[PDB]
Short mmCIF file of C-alpha atoms in Angstrom, two decimals:
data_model
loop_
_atom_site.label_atom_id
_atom_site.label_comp_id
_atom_site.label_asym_id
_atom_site.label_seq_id
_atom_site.Cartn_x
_atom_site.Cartn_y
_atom_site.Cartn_z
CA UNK A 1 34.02 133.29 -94.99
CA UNK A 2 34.82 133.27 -98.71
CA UNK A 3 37.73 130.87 -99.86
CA UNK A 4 40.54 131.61 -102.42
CA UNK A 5 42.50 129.29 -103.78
CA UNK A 6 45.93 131.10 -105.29
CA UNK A 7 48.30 129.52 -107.40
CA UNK A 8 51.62 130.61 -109.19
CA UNK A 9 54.11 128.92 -111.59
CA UNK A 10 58.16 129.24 -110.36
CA UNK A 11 60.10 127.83 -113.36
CA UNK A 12 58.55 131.22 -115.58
CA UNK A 13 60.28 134.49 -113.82
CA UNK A 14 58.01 136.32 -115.47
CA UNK A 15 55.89 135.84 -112.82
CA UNK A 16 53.02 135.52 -115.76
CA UNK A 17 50.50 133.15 -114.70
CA UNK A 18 48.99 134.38 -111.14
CA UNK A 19 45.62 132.43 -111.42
CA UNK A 20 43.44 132.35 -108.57
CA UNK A 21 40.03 130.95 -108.03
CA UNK A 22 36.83 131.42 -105.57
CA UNK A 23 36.31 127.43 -104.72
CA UNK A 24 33.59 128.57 -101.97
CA UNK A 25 31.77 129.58 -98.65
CA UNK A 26 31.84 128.39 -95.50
CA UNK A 27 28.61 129.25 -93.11
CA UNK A 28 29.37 128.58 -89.54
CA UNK A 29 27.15 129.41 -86.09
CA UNK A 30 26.70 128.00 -83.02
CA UNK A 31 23.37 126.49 -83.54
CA UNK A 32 25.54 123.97 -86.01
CA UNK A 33 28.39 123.34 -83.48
CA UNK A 34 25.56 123.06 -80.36
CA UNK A 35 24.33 119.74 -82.66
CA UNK A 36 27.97 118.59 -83.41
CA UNK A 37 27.61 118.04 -87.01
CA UNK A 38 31.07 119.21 -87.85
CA UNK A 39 33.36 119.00 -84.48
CA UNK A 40 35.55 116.23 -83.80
CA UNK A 41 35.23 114.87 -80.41
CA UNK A 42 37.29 112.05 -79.43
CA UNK A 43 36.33 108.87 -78.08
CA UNK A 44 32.83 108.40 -79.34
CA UNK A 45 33.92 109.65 -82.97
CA UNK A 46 36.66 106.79 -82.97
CA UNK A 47 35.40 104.59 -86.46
CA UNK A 48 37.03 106.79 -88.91
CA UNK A 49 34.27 107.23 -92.43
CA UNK A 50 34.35 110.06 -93.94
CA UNK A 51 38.11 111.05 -94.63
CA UNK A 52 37.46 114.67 -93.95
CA UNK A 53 37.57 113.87 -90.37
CA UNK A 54 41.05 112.01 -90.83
CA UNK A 55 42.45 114.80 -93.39
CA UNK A 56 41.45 117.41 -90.47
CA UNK A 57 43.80 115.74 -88.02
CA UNK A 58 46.48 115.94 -90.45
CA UNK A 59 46.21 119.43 -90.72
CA UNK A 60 45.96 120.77 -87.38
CA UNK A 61 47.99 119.04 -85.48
CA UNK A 62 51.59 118.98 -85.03
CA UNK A 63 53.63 116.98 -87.52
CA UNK A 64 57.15 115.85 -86.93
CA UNK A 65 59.06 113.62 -88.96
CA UNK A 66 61.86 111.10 -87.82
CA UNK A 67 64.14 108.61 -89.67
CA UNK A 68 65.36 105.60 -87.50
CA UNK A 69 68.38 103.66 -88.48
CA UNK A 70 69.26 100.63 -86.74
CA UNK A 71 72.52 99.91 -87.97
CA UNK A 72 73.34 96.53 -86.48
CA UNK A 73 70.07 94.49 -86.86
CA UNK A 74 67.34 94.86 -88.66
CA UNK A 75 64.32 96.78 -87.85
CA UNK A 76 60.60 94.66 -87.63
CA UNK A 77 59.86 95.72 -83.86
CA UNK A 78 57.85 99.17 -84.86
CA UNK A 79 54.93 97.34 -86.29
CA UNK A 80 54.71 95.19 -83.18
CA UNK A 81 55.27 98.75 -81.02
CA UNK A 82 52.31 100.33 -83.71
CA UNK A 83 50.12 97.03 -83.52
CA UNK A 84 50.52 95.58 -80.07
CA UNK A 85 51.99 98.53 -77.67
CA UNK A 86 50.57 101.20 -79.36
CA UNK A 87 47.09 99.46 -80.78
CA UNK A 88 46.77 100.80 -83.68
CA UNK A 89 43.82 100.33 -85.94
CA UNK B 1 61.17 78.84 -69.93
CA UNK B 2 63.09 81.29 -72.21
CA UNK B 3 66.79 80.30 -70.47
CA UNK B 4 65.71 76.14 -70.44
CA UNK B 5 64.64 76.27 -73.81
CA UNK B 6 67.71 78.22 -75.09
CA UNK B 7 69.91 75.07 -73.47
CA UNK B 8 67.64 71.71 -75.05
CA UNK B 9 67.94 74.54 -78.64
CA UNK B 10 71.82 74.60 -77.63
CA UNK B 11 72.23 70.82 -76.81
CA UNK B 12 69.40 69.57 -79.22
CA UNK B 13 66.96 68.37 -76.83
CA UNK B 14 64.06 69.56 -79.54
CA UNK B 15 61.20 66.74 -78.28
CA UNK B 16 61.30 67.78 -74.79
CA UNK B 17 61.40 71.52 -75.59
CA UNK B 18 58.17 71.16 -77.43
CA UNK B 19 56.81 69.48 -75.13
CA UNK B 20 57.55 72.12 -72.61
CA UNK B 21 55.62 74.83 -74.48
CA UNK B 22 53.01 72.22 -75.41
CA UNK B 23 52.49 72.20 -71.43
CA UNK B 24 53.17 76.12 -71.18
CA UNK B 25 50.04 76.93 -73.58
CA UNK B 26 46.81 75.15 -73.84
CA UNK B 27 47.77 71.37 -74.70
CA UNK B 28 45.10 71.23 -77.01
CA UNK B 29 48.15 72.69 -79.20
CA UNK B 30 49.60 69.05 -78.69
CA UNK B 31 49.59 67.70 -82.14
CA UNK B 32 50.71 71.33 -83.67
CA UNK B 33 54.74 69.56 -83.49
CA UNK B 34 55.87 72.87 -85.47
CA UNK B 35 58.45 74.52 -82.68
CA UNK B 36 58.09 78.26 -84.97
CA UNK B 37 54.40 77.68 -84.29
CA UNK B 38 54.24 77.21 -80.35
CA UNK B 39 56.89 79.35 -79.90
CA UNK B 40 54.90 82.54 -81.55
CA UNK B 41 51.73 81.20 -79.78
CA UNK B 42 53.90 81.87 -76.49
CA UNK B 43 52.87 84.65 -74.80
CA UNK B 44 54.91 86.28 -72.58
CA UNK B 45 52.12 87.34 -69.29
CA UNK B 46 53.36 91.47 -68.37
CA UNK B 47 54.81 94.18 -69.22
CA UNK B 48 57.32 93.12 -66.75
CA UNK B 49 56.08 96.09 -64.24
CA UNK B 50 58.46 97.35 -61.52
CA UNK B 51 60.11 94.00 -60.41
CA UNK B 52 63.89 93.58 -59.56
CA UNK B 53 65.94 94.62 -62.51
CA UNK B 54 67.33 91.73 -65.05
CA UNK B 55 69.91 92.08 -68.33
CA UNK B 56 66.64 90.29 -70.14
CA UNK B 57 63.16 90.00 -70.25
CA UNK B 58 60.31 86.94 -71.67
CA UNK B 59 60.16 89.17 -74.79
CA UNK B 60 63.71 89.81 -75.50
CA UNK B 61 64.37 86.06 -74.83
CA UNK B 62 61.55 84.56 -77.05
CA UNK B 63 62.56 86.91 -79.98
CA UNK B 64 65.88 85.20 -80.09
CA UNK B 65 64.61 81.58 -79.75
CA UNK B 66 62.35 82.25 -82.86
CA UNK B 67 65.37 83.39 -84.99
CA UNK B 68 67.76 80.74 -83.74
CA UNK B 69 65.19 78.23 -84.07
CA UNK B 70 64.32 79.08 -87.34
CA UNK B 71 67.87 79.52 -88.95
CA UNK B 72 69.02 75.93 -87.67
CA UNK B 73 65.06 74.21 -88.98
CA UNK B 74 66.26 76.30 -92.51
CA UNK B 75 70.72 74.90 -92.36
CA UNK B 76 68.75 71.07 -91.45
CA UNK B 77 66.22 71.14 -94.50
CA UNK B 78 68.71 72.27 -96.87
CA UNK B 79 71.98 69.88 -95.90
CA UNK B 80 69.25 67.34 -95.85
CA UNK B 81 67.61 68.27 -99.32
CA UNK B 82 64.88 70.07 -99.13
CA UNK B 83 65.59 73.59 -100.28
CA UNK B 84 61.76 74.02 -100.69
CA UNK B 85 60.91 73.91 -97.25
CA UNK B 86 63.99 76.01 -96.06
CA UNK B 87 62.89 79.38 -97.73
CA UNK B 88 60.14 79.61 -95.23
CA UNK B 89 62.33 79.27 -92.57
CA UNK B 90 65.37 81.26 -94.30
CA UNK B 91 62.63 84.05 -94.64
CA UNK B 92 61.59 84.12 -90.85
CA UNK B 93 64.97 84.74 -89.57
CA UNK B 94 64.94 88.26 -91.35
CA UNK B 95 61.31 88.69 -90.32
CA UNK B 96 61.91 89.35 -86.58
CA UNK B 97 65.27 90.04 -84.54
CA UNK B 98 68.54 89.53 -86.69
CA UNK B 99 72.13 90.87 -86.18
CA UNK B 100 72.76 91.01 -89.54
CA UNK B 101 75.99 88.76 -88.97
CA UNK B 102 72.72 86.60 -89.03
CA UNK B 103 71.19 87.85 -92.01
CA UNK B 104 74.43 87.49 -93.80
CA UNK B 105 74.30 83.84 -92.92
CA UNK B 106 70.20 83.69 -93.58
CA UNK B 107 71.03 85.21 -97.15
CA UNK B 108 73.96 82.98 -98.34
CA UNK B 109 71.75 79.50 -96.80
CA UNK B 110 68.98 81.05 -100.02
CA UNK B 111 72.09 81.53 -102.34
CA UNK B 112 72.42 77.49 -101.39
CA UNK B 113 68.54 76.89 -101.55
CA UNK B 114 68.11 78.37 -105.23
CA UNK B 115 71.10 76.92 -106.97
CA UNK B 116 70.05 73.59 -105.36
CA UNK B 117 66.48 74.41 -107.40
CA UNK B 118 67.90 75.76 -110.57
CA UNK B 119 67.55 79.06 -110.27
CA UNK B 120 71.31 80.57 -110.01
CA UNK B 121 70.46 84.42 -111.08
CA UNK B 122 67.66 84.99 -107.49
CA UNK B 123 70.86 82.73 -105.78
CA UNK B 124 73.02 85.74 -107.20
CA UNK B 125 70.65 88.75 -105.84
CA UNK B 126 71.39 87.31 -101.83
CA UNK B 127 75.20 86.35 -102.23
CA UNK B 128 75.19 90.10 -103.75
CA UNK B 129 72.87 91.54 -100.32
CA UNK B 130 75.08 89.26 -97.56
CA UNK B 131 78.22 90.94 -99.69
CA UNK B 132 76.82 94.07 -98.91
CA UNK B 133 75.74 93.97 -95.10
CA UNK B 134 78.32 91.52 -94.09
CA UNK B 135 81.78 91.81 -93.02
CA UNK B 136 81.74 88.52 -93.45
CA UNK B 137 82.19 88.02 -97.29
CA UNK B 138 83.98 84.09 -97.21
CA UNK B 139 80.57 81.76 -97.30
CA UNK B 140 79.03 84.21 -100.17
CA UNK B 141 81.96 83.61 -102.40
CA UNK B 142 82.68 80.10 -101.99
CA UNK B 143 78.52 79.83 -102.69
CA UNK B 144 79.46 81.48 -106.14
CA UNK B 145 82.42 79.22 -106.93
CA UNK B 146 79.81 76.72 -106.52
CA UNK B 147 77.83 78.11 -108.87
CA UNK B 148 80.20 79.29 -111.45
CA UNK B 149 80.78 75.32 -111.31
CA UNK B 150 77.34 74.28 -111.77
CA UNK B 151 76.85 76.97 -114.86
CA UNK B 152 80.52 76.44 -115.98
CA UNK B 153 81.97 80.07 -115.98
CA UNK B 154 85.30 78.38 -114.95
CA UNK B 155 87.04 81.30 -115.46
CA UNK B 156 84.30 83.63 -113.00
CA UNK B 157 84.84 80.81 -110.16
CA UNK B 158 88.73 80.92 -110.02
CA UNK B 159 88.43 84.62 -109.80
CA UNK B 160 85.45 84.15 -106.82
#
């Protein structure tokens, strides 16, 4: 597959400035995948090095976004629930 | 451990309740006299798995004796004059479980500790914050009276 990158400017409604630009090629078989090399296969793949393995979990997956408001106390306990219940690296 | 503790912390039996978590973790921690140490060294042993029921839990207990602990350490210290020690203290209420009738209180006890150290604009940012949160808005003021004294601005403290 080819890649195309497409941008356009909002604030001019001319719509003048439709830029674009080829920013690659992607070759892809099995032969690659049958030696892992770019899959992400969870645990053994667990030490997180090259950030293109986390930035590919924050694109496919499912995002969801939550605010929390405790409005009589004060809210510490989520790092303990991240750190300690959770176990989080 | 939680509930005996909570009565020597209500009837100031402080010795003996160290002592008690001295014995409850290793007692190798036996010269380690800090209370807000031992008592975050206390581990509570389960997740409390499918037992009977109970309105509390080691957890839910222990996060209250480190705030109420920590508050009175912080009102001692400064009464007793040493509002350099107290801000540690003052801090570790709000760092950990805290009604926010007890943050008020944590926040106006560092409007105390700063003017006591010369400092009476940080004293002004934590009168201002317990203002805020609290419903509670009498120890704040009288704080800035006491401060409008110590500066002068006689005419500021009998409007506060």
């Amino acid at each position: 597959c080819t890649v195309l990158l497409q941008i356009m400017e909002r604030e001019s409604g001319n719509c003048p400035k439709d830029r674009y630009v080829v920013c690659g090629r992607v070759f892809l078989s099995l032969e690659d995948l049958s030696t892992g090399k770019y899959l992400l296969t969870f645990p053994k793949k667990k030490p997180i090095e090259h950030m293109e393995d986390l930035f590919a979990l924050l694109a496919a997956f499912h995002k969801s976004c939550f605010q929390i408001t405790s409005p009589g106390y004060a809210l510490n306990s989520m790092k303990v629930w991240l750190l300690e219940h959770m176990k989080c690296e | 451990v939680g509930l005996q503790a909570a009565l020597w912390l209500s009837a100031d039996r402080l010795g003996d309740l160290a002592l008690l978590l001295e014995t409850l973790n290793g007692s190798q921690s036996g010269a380690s006299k800090d209370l807000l140490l031992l008592l975050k060294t206390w581990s509570p042993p389960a997740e409390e798995l499918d037992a009977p029921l109970t309105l509390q839990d080691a957890q839910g207990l222990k996060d209250v004796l480190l705030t109420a602990f920590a508050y009175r350490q912080g009102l001692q210290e400064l009464i007793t004059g040493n509002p350099d020690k107290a801000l540690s203290s003052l801090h570790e209420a709000a760092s950990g479980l805290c009604p926010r009738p007890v943050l008020v209180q944590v926040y106006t006890a560092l409007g105390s500790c700063h003017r006591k150290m010369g400092n009476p604009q940080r004293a002004l940012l934590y009168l201002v914050a317990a203002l805020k949160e609290g419903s509670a808005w009498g120890p704040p003021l009288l704080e800035a009276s006491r401060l409008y004294q110590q500066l002068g601005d006689t005419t500021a403290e009998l409007e506060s």
